[PDB]
Amino acid sequence: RVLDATQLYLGEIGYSPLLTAEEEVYFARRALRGDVASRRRMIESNLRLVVKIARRYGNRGLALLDLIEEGNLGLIRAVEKFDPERGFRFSTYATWWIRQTIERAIMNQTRTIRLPIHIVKELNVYLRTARELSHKLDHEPSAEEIAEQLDKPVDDVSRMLRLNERITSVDTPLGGDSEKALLDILADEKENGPEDTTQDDDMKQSIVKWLFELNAKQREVLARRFGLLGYEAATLEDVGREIGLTRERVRQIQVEGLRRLREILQTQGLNIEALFL
Amino acid sequence: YSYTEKKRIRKDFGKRPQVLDVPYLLSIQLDSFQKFIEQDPEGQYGLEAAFRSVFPIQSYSGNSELQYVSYRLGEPVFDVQECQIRGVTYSAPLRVKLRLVIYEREAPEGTVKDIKEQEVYMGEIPLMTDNGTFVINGTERVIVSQLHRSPGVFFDSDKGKTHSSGKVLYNARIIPYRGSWLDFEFDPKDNLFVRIDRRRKLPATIILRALNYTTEQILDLFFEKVIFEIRDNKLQMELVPERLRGETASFDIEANGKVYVEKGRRITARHIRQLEKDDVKLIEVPVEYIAGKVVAKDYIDESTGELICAANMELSLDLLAKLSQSGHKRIETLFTNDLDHGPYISETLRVDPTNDRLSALVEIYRMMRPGEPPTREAAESLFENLFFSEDRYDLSAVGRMKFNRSLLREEIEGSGILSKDDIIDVMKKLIDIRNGKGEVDDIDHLGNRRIRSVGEMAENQFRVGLVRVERAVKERLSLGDLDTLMPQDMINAKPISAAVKEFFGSSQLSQFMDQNNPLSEITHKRRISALGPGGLTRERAGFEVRDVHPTHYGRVCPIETPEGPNIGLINSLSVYAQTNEYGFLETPYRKVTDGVVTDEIHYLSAIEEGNYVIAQANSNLDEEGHFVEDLVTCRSKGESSLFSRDQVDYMDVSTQQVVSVGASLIPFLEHDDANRALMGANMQRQAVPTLRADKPLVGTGMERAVAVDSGVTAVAKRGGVVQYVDASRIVIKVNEDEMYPGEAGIDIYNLTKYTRSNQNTCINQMPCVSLGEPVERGDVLADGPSTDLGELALGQNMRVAFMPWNGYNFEDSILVSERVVQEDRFTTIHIQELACVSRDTKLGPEEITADIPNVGEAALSKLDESGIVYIGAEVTGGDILVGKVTPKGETQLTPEEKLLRAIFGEKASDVKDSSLRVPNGVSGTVIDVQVFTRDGVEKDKRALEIEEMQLKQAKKDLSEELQILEAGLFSRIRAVLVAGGVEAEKLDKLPRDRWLELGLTDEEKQNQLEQLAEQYDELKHEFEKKLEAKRRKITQGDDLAPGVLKIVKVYLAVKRRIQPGDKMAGRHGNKGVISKINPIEDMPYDENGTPVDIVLNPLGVPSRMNIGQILETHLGMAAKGIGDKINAMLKQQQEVAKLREFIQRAYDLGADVRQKVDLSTFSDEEVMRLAENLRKGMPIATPVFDGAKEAEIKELLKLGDLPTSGQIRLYDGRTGEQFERPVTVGYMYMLKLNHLVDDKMHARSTGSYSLVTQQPLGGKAQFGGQRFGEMEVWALEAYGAAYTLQEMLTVKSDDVNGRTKMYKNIVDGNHQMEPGMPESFNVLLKEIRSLGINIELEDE
Amino acid sequence: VPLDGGRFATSDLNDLYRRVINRNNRLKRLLDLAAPDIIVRNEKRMLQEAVDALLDNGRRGRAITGSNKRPLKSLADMIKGKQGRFRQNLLGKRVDYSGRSVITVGPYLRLHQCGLPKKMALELFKPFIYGKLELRGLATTIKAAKKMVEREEAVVWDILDEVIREHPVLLNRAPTLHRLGIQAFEPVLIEGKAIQLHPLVCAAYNADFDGDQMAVHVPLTLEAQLEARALMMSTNNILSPANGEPIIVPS
Amino acid sequence: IETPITANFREGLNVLQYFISTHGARKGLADTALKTANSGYLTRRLVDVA
DNA sequence: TCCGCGTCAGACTCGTAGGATTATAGCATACGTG
DNA sequence: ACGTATGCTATAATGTGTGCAGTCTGACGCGG
Ligand SMILES: Nc1ccn([C@@H]2O[C@H](COP(=O)(O)OP(=O)(O)OP(=O)(O)O)[C@@H](O)[C@H]2O)c(=O)n1
């Protein structure tokens, strides 16, 4: 029989009212006053018109089935707000809706990184300006060549062209040979190998030994300021909250702790060795 | 002979004079693309075809239409020089003229209403170079010619679909160039079926009904007629004597007066002539004979008017009696035969559930569009659209040609659409083959495998651009306003541009040119593939395709194909092979006229090769006459045997036509196994050119042909004297005869100097000519990277000795002297290109300054203020080439870093570091740096210093152009002026700017002075706009990717030396790794003292069966022996006459040497320049199969005062005592393969980690550990080693806890197992849960 | 995740997910409108097409093709067959303390020995240098030891040389047919980018010195050092397990 | 092939003798690449059960 | 239960190489947070 | 006020199709 979701729906619309001028008015007049049956009919009837409008709006974002669904939603809003008393036809009024609802739904579900209409609307005019230029320049227009024709900012054009960049899939094969994808190459930003993990662990264990090698009143002031031992990273002035309660003596004692510690790094074998780092 | 040839002549051991000279090896690629751009006026080809095919396009209403007028190519925006550097396509503007014509609706056809006309751009097409390459995004790339099934008709049979029946089911299939497929196929019950697009199976009479054919007509077309007359009472029947042939007499066969055959007896050929000579026409028969016979046409009762019996119905006794009394005593029936004329359409109609034409178009429509209710038009439109519309269907020229000659037709050229005739004719020959006559075609025959080069493929992809525009034209025309809308508003230039760049990039045939060797370039351009789109697949590929087919002879090389899964599909073209005008291949053949082997040559197609008998090139000509021997070994019908003289029709032209270019360079191929020959030709393509191009002592002759045709060298367009020689360029003065009278006549050749290759190697062009040397037209002026005096120089020859050496040549392992390494002869060049990118991040823009945080003055020493390393600066891994800095965000300065940046200080600018530094390991010399900037943000100071040079160098270079062009232009006027008003010095008093002021008498030469005067001005005005183009393109800012602001590209110059791990080989597939570079003290040496260069293993020979290397060695030694004698006489400073006698005695030695070079013709000066190049060794040519034999080689060895054997008395270097017995020593031309160990070795302790699997990455490219696969795993399972495995599953791979924890434990010394459980499994749990499956880890 | 080139990249799952959510939310919208059933039917058929395409794309009908005319990789696909998690990202792994290089002959070596390049073993035994360095007191910390190694100073070679002695390394050749496809040796540092292998065990690997490469692996744990010396050592592996016959035989 | 190769590597093959040698050479090397997967797949099959 | 033909499952293991898309109007009040 | 989002336009128009079609041996699973 038929097992294609496409042809099944396309069959059921092929057995649905085809309304005349005065028929549309009769149903629409009752549809606004809520006849229930009437709203269902005008819709059922004009599903055929949605498909012919989605036959030119394809291969742009979603599939043909996806356009018909969102195109049907435009016909419904057209039925919610049609004027039967006006002598003008319905097929004319509904086309404005079905073309709009499709374009709009493509502008959202086409790009992975969601782009609102504002940035998109503008981008189109920049691209449609590129057409005119391209045909007469015979050269794909630059960010400048587009900015000179619109007399608009350079960064704007560039900023709008930076949002038009497409995205390749991580699982995409590499070079007419599905040997390795991009995931089998792309590194993990977050975790650096044990070498970098043990660097900080060993460097920060060496500091724990250097703070116990200093004075009791020199590590109690230096540590709690930087937030090394304490809970919050305070400043010269804020160390006064604890017991110091000083501004001059905190600054003399901070630097006194660091000067004795600079000699501890010159003797252990760092100083200028660990200065490049 | 020529001058460049006089410098060094190659001794040719050929004995089969070349009647056909080797062609330009790059014929296909250049001629193909030439067709594509070629604007043919009528005979549409390439673009002209694409437009006339699609256009004219008309609206969906049909009131408005767009019509193609004419197109053109503008000169390239950026030329090759520029394109290669910037990094954008070398393409030309496409300007096509369109015409928008609109009709009147109520009026008939008001064609003259608004004939709008304008010119429109759409897409820029990559042009082809003179080398047959396409410059795509600054890469010379090559498009490989495709090999696919030729359109038309084809008969096949699955030798046992159902081995249940084991019945050979025959099938036919119409393959178009564009359109739907049309197949016919039998079944176990011999019912003919038709499957359009190999969709549903439909009875084969349903398609005939669709072509309006009644049951009667169908039968009348296939089956013959058997006439039955019912005279009075006796039933009678027409007999063609040749019918009851090979059958049995089921009844008593008796005539006007005689019983011929008895019941149950076989009717033999005697009985058939017995009846045929008696002229028997009518025979009385029984009524039981018709029971079974099928009635042909319909038979209505004359009386009632009803069908007594419909057409195609098996008769019976009662039906026949019903027909006899109806009033029909003339019945027609089918001539059914289970052996010859088979009843198939008959039994098929009984299955066929259709009725008339209109109902036949229904099931055809219900097959392809199932579910849509059918109408009269929808069913008719579909079927008419399939194989019967000028739009959907197109067999093409080749399609109709093969289709016709497959049906043994009348026409070569006909219609693109299938006619009714065509279909039934195809069903007819399918049924012919089923009967017995007719043979099936096979796909492996090259008569069915057509070649499709680039130009035809560029045409195809250009059509899809036009097809995708067709959509936008029609829809915009109908609903859009007629007047306002202009034709370019409806055209889009992107769909064409995108569809063509799709081909010039993503396609499998468009791949990066393999240019690490002249042989690689020329053999990769002569590559032909069956893969990619519209071809085959490793997954789909069988064996019989791959297998060498006797059609390959002369057309395709038997020994040229990768040994990789793409083995039999990829193949190089043969030497003298060429494409048929239609598509198939064709090979040269010497015609034999009345026994006389005429020099007239005919390129026989793959089809006509089978027809004539073809003698081999082994056969002996009688010096203008015929075959010396009466019997000649020849070949035909794809088989080989001896034939007489008159029977021979054609002969192989040369002895090298069977093989390709790759194989034509292998000497003594004849003494080499095809398996090792293949590998040898495959590795010869991988031969990285050396520092100093060394000529091959043991060549074939094809050497020069390759080097020259490769387009890597610079050959003279016009002969004359080299006015100026230079490392960068060459200036040659043209002779009077060749020089044009209009222009000056001084050619300019700016030689390509050291720059990068696609494989990251050296490309140089050194002048092979001396200052002020007389050069002939078409002579090599500058040599390439792997060429020497025009001849190909891939690797280097050296004294080799075959013997074991303390296992340092174990399994083909190589033992090379340090003396080879001292001469730096196998030392190679590797120009590596690195880049530095300034991007625009979310935080802010990056720049390029010397200001880099956390750095030593030592790093910024080689940089300038701008932040780019100086030209000529040596660099090493860790040193920074180009200083870059990016913005630093919200960066969490960790407490331990805030304190460390507060102690030592240097509060690094809120600007991150990412300077381009030499990669860890690499070290060489910066030879140049190029800066690309967006047209905007202000530049670096070094970028201005480089602009200074480009400009002032271009101003000088153009000054030099107009200067030397002036001198050559007045040089003419000076000679013209003397003719007439003869005055020497008095004319040369005042300067040369007042020479156009002087004239001559009313004469042709007065018109000449006016030409040169106004052409001097033409160059004077041209010089300014030539300066404008240079100046602007230097000031011009280069378009970059979005986000990028500017880039700095660095060129290094790494010079890697040979070392253990380097892979080298001969050209006989003899591979090997260098194991040890032996000391000069330890190398074996002859009695005389000179040591050996390489020591090869003799056991890499018998098993290999590639004895060609040993002959290469023997001849190389003999050749060198002769050079050693000439070297000695030139050192001794002897005489011209003494060298002349010896060298004449050398060139003339072979049995019938092809070249007979007299030295009495050579002048004294020409002899000494020759001997000086012969001293390294007399270069010898051993044609592929017409090479030298032992008689010739051993005779040459006696001239060199070398041993007849080739084995020398060797002494061990380590010791000094002799080896127990002699060893073969000689000069073998070996190669340095691209597989160098510095580009291989890798190591890893801990590094990057994968993104989700959380195991390490892959490759030394990304610094990844070696993969331990399941096979590697089972190995440790077998051993029992459990931790060694668990260690390689967890801490070394995923286990995030384990890897870092174990690291800390190792530095502690405690190598302790600390497992957890790899991440990649934790992923697999959630991945199965995401599939809606409860997978939890159930505990103890 | 974003590329270095300002581009982004997404897995095909995200794309397949957006097909499911869009259609599911559109169904919520149409059930709000009380739309005719003919439309609701299409929406439900679509929703199922999307769900079925998310679980296993290429199965029920045509697999939903995406950008590069190729089919979207679904969920089931990452658990399916060779290219799945099992065979590719679990039973087989790329491994640390691993290096590979062109092999060449080692006719001077004994059976229990193999040439190992210095610069190779250098990087391979990186945490063992940092460890022996803190013991001698030459490095105070590990980033100090890191720089000592980087500068390739003379006295660091002698420490590297110390740890490697009495330390086995695994040498693998592809393909790994039988257990002998890996054998352990005592590394001998050699200046050169080539590995030097023992001629007699060449038979087990089927290693021809014509451009072969062999992967190196360092056994980290003491148990792995014992396992490598006890089970996987070349001397302890003579006869084939297939046939009680010596595979270690000259040629 | 009904007609084998008469010559050896010392005396040298003619043009066809080599053309003939190809047919056997390509098919022998085709079964080195393609037929290997069945044998290696057997190893895989055997292992899992054992 | 048996035969025919539809779908569905495999096809050895490690190393290297490089790139690019089309288009969704146009303008005026409605919804969310400093 | 700024960005996002929702809204409406009135000639008539009312059922899609597009695109690769020498794999192959072996094994079941629904009807017929
Ligand atoms: N496609 C390939 C090529 C090679 N190998 C491996 O490489 C080895 C050696 O291949 P090769 O050197 O070509 O074969 P040999 O038997 O050494 O023969 P030759 O004398 O031609 O070197 C094979 O046994 C095999 O382990 C492989 O597995 N798959």
Ligand SMILES: [Mg+2]
């Ligand atoms: Mg090998």
Ligand SMILES: [Mg+2]
């Ligand atoms: Mg080998």
